[PDB]
Motif scaffolding. Structure first.
Motif, PDB file in Angstrom:
ATOM      1  N   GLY A  56      -1.590   0.451  -8.348  1.00  0.00           N
ATOM      2  CA  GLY A  56      -1.607  -0.175  -7.045  1.00  0.00           C
ATOM      3  C   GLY A  56      -0.681  -1.363  -6.873  1.00  0.00           C
ATOM      4  O   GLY A  56      -0.596  -1.895  -5.757  1.00  0.00           O
ATOM      5  N   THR A  57      -0.014  -1.819  -7.940  1.00  0.00           N
ATOM      6  CA  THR A  57       0.984  -2.873  -7.784  1.00  0.00           C
ATOM      7  C   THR A  57       2.142  -2.396  -6.918  1.00  0.00           C
ATOM      8  O   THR A  57       2.629  -3.135  -6.055  1.00  0.00           O
ATOM      9  CB  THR A  57       1.490  -3.336  -9.151  1.00  0.00           C
ATOM     10  OG1 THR A  57       0.373  -3.665  -9.986  1.00  0.00           O
ATOM     11  CG2 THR A  57       2.359  -4.576  -8.999  1.00  0.00           C
ATOM     12  N   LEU A  58       2.571  -1.155  -7.112  1.00  0.00           N
ATOM     13  CA  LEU A  58       3.596  -0.540  -6.289  1.00  0.00           C
ATOM     14  C   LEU A  58       3.002   0.677  -5.590  1.00  0.00           C
ATOM     15  O   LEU A  58       2.144   1.368  -6.150  1.00  0.00           O
ATOM     16  CB  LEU A  58       4.811  -0.159  -7.145  1.00  0.00           C
ATOM     17  CG  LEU A  58       6.124   0.350  -6.537  1.00  0.00           C
ATOM     18  CD1 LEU A  58       7.258   0.003  -7.482  1.00  0.00           C
ATOM     19  CD2 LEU A  58       6.125   1.854  -6.278  1.00  0.00           C
ATOM     20  N   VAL A  59       3.451   0.928  -4.363  1.00  0.00           N
ATOM     21  CA  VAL A  59       3.004   2.078  -3.588  1.00  0.00           C
ATOM     22  C   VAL A  59       4.197   2.981  -3.301  1.00  0.00           C
ATOM     23  O   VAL A  59       5.328   2.521  -3.116  1.00  0.00           O
ATOM     24  CB  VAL A  59       2.286   1.653  -2.284  1.00  0.00           C
ATOM     25  CG1 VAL A  59       1.038   0.852  -2.610  1.00  0.00           C
ATOM     26  CG2 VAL A  59       3.200   0.826  -1.400  1.00  0.00           C
ATOM     27  N   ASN A  73       3.829  -3.524  -2.590  1.00  0.00           N
ATOM     28  CA  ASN A  73       2.540  -3.660  -1.927  1.00  0.00           C
ATOM     29  C   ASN A  73       2.664  -4.667  -0.772  1.00  0.00           C
ATOM     30  O   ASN A  73       3.593  -5.479  -0.722  1.00  0.00           O
ATOM     31  CB  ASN A  73       1.490  -4.072  -2.974  1.00  0.00           C
ATOM     32  CG  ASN A  73       0.130  -4.431  -2.385  1.00  0.00           C
ATOM     33  OD1 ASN A  73      -0.250  -3.951  -1.315  1.00  0.00           O
ATOM     34  ND2 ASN A  73      -0.609  -5.280  -3.089  1.00  0.00           N
ATOM     35  N   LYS A  74       1.724  -4.583   0.179  1.00  0.00           N
ATOM     36  CA  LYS A  74       1.739  -5.447   1.360  1.00  0.00           C
ATOM     37  C   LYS A  74       1.597  -6.919   0.989  1.00  0.00           C
ATOM     38  O   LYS A  74       2.299  -7.774   1.543  1.00  0.00           O
ATOM     39  CB  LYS A  74       0.619  -5.039   2.320  1.00  0.00           C
ATOM     40  CG  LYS A  74       0.612  -3.580   2.807  1.00  0.00           C
ATOM     41  CD  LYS A  74       1.743  -3.234   3.781  1.00  0.00           C
ATOM     42  CE  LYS A  74       2.913  -2.525   3.112  1.00  0.00           C
ATOM     43  NZ  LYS A  74       3.956  -2.129   4.097  1.00  0.00           N
ATOM     44  N   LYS A  75       0.697  -7.237   0.065  1.00  0.00           N
ATOM     45  CA  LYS A  75       0.531  -8.614  -0.396  1.00  0.00           C
ATOM     46  C   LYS A  75       0.874  -8.725  -1.878  1.00  0.00           C
ATOM     47  O   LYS A  75       1.908  -9.285  -2.243  1.00  0.00           O
ATOM     48  CB  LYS A  75      -0.897  -9.128  -0.151  1.00  0.00           C
ATOM     49  CG  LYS A  75      -1.208  -9.612   1.274  1.00  0.00           C
ATOM     50  CD  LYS A  75      -1.351  -8.489   2.293  1.00  0.00           C
ATOM     51  CE  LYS A  75      -1.753  -9.036   3.654  1.00  0.00           C
ATOM     52  NZ  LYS A  75      -1.789  -7.979   4.700  1.00  0.00           N
TER      53      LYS A  75
END
Length: 75
Positions: A56-59, A73-75
């Motif tokens: 989940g660090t990168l999407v 990621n968004k944040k």
DNA sequence: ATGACAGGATGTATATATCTGACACGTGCCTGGAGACTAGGGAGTAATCCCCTTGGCGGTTAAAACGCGGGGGACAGCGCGTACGTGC
């Protein structure tokens, strides 16, 4: 030895941050320009580029698994 | 951001005058096609036989077939360096 290649892959993907995300081709070319081996460790990168999508660090933007585009990621 | 809808402009097709040479038509001729007859031979036809193909019978397993599985394949998704595609 040195650091693990997760940090190297994060630098490679954070170098550009294009609106249409980096290919697997362009990111391994960036890692080869950095100097990290991408030919025998391509199994290690193969598993890493789906492990980083999974944690989940990168999407992943448009492709599937390690294919296609990638963004932060968004944040 | 993306897709849905209008419009122009020039390239390609659309409508009309010209000419020309090449389709087309007219003529000399002699080669070409062929009538009669023949020579002579290929070839159709009988027959027969025999053997080589067709028909059948018993046993094996070689081959067919069927199914579970497993790891290989196929091919899309998307990006990217590119590599002509294209205007001039």
């Amino acid at each position: 030895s040195g650091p693990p290649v997760s940090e190297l892959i994060t630098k490679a993907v954070a170098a550009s941050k294009e609106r249409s995300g980096v290919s697997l081709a362009a990111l391994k070319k960036a890692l080869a320009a950095a100097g990290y081996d991408v030919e025998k460790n391509n199994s290690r990168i193969k598993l890493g580029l789906k492990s980083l999508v999974s944690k989940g660090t990168l999407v992943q933007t448009k492709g599937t698994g390690a294919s296609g585009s990638f963004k932060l990621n968004k944040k």
